[PDB]
Design a protein around this ligand. Structure first.
Ligand SMILES: CC(C)C[C@H](N)C(=O)NS(=O)(=O)OC[C@H]1O[C@@H](CCn2nnc(-c3ccccc3)n2)[C@H](O)[C@@H]1O
Ligand SMILES: [Mg+2]
Ligand SMILES: [Zn+2]
Length: 826
């Protein structure tokens, strides 16, 4: 055994040892209990980042821990390969997106393997291969004929200079983020998943996820946004019917979740596209300008509640069906056409948004709820204004004194008797638009025929292969300019036809890849019935918080779709969910000629102040934030691996912070991780240099010295703490510190005697197995010097209960014939 720890010597050897043994190449074996640990598969962007290493080390810690506990562990990895990055790099470098993608996949795969992740590489998938995306095309056609996928006109943001569609997030003050040109609102046909048909299922099944963080479930419930409210129809006043036709000339219909406050409505608001807005704006230019600005907006959903709420009066009036109050109709920008009736009522006294809106325009506020003897101030919002649990109605005629639920039913009774309303359930959830005007994506398996219509491609003809011999030029979507691709014959009548040229939302590939891992070479379905029955669902899912809403919802949606098709047997894809924190780093900048700042990468800086590691001039040390190319502060994990080895990288990330907490890059912290790995190496080397390995202590410890009994107690309490940290709390930093405390007590214990050597062997054999999930290379190597058995067959260390019992000293007491501090307690 070499005296000094050298990762480059031992890390490749241990990896070949694991690969030769095929410990991570698992099958559907009915003898061993299964464990499916999955980390969110990455985009092949080019090279691993520090967040990748943290995500996939966490998965490897939990996977190796369950492996040592005798589980049949599947930890698969693949490549979420489609998307815009390969298209931009194609436009920048004059390379095909597929070639750029497959080169990145190969390099990053090398990086993942060099980190020693226990991964079943025989189950690797790449979502840009026809062998993969043919099966989401298949599900597309199957759901298309059922109507779960449907085609409909929708509005997109067209950039006329970049000749491409932009999402709301890419529109800055009505202009494209890169082109700077005014974007145009265009109505084009697109395809949608009818996800609202599954809204109640997706909402209620969240209750089954006892091992999900409550914030993720709460974020999903809010996104679905189920409400049990009331449709209410306000009759249009006789003086306000000019320009209206149909039911819009008769009444204004609204949806409210607070029909108990209907007696407090002081005005109503309609969307810009509402017929009342159109009729009132017919001769009022300010209204036309207000309507035009609302239509031209591109507020993203994450920013919808933070935009300033503005409105204009219409001069039109409607009648409250309960009290007869005549309320003026306003056009408001927060009322969205397509949500409900595109019209709301406003109760400023008990809805905070209505309170600020009314305070802005000096609109009336009528208190109709009371909570105890609290004072109501019309000029200052108080939180109890919106209380639904502990309020009684006031100023509401015969509704006074009622609570929320009894007033709800009474108002429903009054409105239904008049025919002016009825209870109604609504959802904020919109249908899922999957059409993308992009090239590097899964082709939509639809053929357009002027005789047969939009026709799904038959199953025999799938996949619709995306041609990889393409270099996008930025003058529109390439597929739309490739007659060799879209010109085809109709599969129904054989006539002249054209393929769909839009590609799928790349969220689709990541909505079912966890099932494909179960049988990634199955050629007769999305996933084989045998593999799905065995692996069931994912036991542990690890990923970033940025996917807590859309990705998880889409994955749960696809799981229920595939279940209804009879392909899988589970209602939920992910049992346990672990969301790991971001990785932050210091930033460095230099002031600019033009009054700006030039951000410098940390690796090109040396501390002392701070100066460049190649030049000699000083730079400015700035704030710490998430590693990104924005402020040029991304630390390359490859340089960390090259400088210290994979175990140091894995150890630092697990020790620096709990997995959910933000991890700050620390040069001294990395050195501390490497120094501990050297200490662990020296501890084993020095132990073996003083007499070699012996049989580890086991059995009755009566007769052991007090010092060695205390070391066994610390040992088996460390094992219990570490097991509870890996399995239950999932806090790996405290598990490392516990092993460090065990090594500290070992260092202070004399283990020179025959029984001392036996206890020392027991300590080190457990310590290397307790740390094997975190730093497997050095633990695999150190274990082989201590014991001949295979580490993974020796299994996770067991807790000796007898090592935790303390020896009593039952003594008798007598005063005047019928430890001295214990008798003082007596
Ligand atoms: C399941 C699907 C939807 C996952 C999807 N393919 C994805 O997010 N793929 S991904 O590759 O973006 O991330 C995969 C997982 O790794 C963690 C950290 C990733 N990361 N850290 N830093 C960086 C980075 C920073 C600057 C520039 C470039 C990269 N990216 C994420 O939270 C995910 O859980
Ligand atoms: Mg359960
Ligand atoms: Zn046809």
């Amino acid at each position: 055994m070499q005296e000094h720890y050298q990762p480059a010597a031992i890390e490749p050897a241990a990896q070949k040892k694991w690969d030769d043994a095929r410990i991570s190449n698992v099958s559907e074996d009915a003898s061993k209990p299964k464990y499916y640990c999955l980390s969110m598969f990455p985009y092949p962007s080019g090279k691993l980042h520090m967040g990748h290493v943290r995500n996939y080390t966490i998965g490897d810690v939990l996977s190796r821990f369950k492996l040592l506990n005798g589980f049949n562990v599947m930890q698969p990895m693949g490549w979420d390969a489609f998307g815009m990055p390969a298209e931009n790099a194609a436009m920048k470098n004059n390379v095909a997106p597929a070639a750029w993608t497959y080169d990145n996949i190969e390099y990053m795969k090398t990086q993942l393997k060099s980190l020693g992740f226990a991964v079943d590489w025989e189950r690797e998938v790449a979502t840009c291969k026809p062998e993969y995306y043919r099966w989401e095309q298949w599900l597309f056609t199957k759901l298309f004929e059922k109507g779960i996928v449907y085609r409909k006109n929708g509005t997109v943001n067209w950039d006329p200079v970049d000749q491409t569609v932009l999402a709301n997030e890419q529109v800055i003050d009505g202009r494209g983020w890169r082109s700077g040109a005014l974007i145009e609102k265009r109505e084009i046909p697109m395809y949608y998943f009818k996800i609202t048909d599954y809204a109640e299922e997706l909402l209620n099944d969240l209750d089954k996820l006892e091992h999900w963080p409550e914030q993720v479930k709460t974020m999903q419930r809010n996104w679905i946004g189920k409400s049990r409210g009331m449709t209410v129809r306000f009759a249009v006043s006789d003086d306000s019917k000019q320009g209206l036709e149909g039911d819009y000339a008769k009444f204004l219909q609204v949806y409210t979740t607070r029909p108990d406050t209907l007696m407090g409505a002081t005005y109503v608001a309609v969307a810009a596209e509402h017929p009342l807005a159109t009729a009132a704006a017919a001769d009022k230019p300010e209204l036309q300008a207000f309507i035009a600005e609302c239509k031209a907006g591109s507020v993203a959903e994450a920013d919808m509640a933070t935009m300033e709420k503005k409105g204009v009066p219409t001069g039109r009036y409607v009648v409250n069906p309960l009290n007869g109050d005549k309320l003026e109709v306003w056009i408001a920008n927060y009322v969205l056409w397509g949500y409900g009736d595109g019209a709301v009522m406003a109760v400023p006294a008990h809805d905070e948004r209505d309170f600020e809106f009314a305070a802005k325009y000096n609109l009336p506020k009528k208190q109709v709820i009371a909570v105890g003897d609290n004072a109501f101030d019309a000029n200052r919002w108080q939180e109890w204004y919106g209380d639904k649990e502990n309020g009684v109605l006031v100023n509401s005629g015969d509704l006074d004194g009622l609570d929320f639920q009894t007033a709800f039913d009474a108002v429903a009774a009054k409105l239904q008797s008049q025919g002016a309303g009825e209870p109604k359930t609504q959802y904020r959830l919109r249908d899922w638009g999957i059409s993308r005007q992009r090239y590097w994506g899964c082709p939509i398996p639809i053929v357009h025929c002027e005789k047969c219509g939009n026709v799904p491609v038959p199953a025999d003809q799938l996949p619709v292969v995306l041609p990889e011999n393409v270099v996008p030029d930025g003058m529109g979507s390439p597929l739309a300019k490739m007659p060799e691709f879209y010109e085809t014959s109709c599969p129904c009548c054989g006539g002249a036809a054209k393929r769909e040229t839009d590609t799928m939302d790349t969220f689709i590939e990541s909505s079912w890849y966890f099932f494909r891992y179960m049988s990634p070479k199955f050629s007769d379905g999305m996933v084989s019935a045998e593999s799905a029955k065995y692996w069931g669902a994912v036991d542990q899912y690890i990923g970033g918080i940025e996917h807590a809403i859309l990705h998880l919802l889409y994955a749960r949606f696809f799981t229920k779709l595939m279940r209804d098709e009879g392909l899988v047997n589970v209602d939920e894809p992910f049992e346990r969910l672990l969301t790991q924190g971001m990785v932050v780093c210091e930033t460095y900048y230099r002031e600019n000629d033009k009054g700006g700042k030039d951000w410098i990468n940390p690796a090109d800086v040396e501390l002392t102040s701070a100066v460049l590691k190649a030049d000699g001039l000083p730079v400015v040390i700035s704030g710490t934030e998430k590693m990104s190319k924005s402020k040029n502060n991304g630390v390359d994990p490859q340089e960390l691996i090259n400088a210290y080895g994979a175990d140091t990288a894995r150890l630092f990330m697990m020790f620096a912070a709990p997995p959910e907490q933000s991890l700050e890059w620390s040069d001294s912290g990395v050195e501390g991780a490497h120094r501990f790995l050297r200490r662990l190496w020296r501890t084993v080397y020095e132990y073996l240099k003083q007499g070699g390995a012996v049989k580890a202590f086991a059995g009755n410890q009566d007769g052991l010295s007090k010092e060695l009994k205390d070391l066994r107690h610390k040992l088996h309490s460390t094992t219990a703490k570490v097991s509870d940290d890996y399995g239950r709390r999932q806090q790996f930093n405290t598990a490392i510190a516990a092993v460090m405390e065990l090594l500290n007590q070992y260092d202070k214990t004399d283990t020179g005697s025959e029984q001392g050597r036996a206890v020392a062997q027991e300590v080190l054999e457990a310590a290397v197995r307790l740390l094997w999930p975190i730093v497997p290379h050095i633990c695999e190597t150190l274990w082989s010097e201590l014991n001949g058995a295979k580490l993974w067959e020796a299994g996770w260390p067991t807790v000796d209960e007898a090592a935790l019992v303390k020896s009593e000293i039952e003594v008798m007491v007598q005063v005047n014939g019928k430890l001295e501090a214990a008798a003082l307690a007596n």
